[PDB]
Design a protein around this ligand. Structure first.
Ligand code: ZN
Length: 192
């Protein structure tokens, strides 16, 4: 079945953390990633993207020390830095176990799907969220999921959040279709 094939793909790219952690929650994160269309997961594997699950802060990892003490875009005036952010996506994917849900230090409906979407956008699709077509859709629909000063201002964040809505569950998929029909259609066409 497609679920088992996606888990097979994920078994080759997911890096579980050193040390001890909530193993059931880490498994739950993998099971949510397995709902992403296999085409995208296998394209990430082709590009040697590692999905790193972490048991500590993002900036405890050597490869993210360049973010120590830096304020992410949109976090200005909050006193928070990347040290306090539970997930990152783009050229890499890093995810703190236990912080999946909205409000756990981040605004996404689901951390792992949002961050992995960034990697798909950047690594696989050459920053499609900043392509002319998506910029047009973002200009009309980019505020319709709320968070208008973040999703509505950064097309790469609107893309990642829409992707997460599309793939998390049937409730979020239907909410995206109602709120952002052109974005939904774009994602339908992207998967074909
Ligand atoms: Zn993001």
């Amino acid at each position: 079945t497609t679920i088992q094939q996606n888990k097979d793909t994920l078994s080759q790219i997911v890096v579980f953390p050193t040390g001890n952690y909530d193993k059931n929650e880490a498994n739950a994160m993998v099971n949510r990633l397995a709902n992403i269309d296999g085409k995208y997961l296998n394209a990430l594997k082709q590009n040697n993207l590692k999905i790193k699950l972490l048991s500590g802060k993002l900036t405890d990892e050597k490869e993210y020390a360049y973010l120590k003490g830096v304020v992410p875009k949109g976090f200005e005036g909050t006193g928070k830095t990347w040290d306090d952010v539970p997930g990152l996506g783009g050229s890499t994917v890093a995810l703190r176990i236990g912080f999946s849900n909205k409000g756990k230090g981040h605004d996404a409906i689901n951390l792992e799907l949002h961050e992995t979407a960034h990697a798909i956008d950047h690594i696989v699709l050459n920053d499609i969220s900043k392509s002319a077509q998506f910029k047009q859709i973002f200009a009309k629909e980019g505020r319709s999921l709320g968070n208008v000063n973040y999703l509505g201002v950064y097309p790469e964040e609107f893309f990642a959040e829409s992707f997460a809505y599309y793939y998390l569950n049937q409730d979020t998929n239907s909410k995206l279709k109602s709120a952002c029909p052109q974005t939904y259609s774009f994602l339908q066409n992207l998967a074909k």
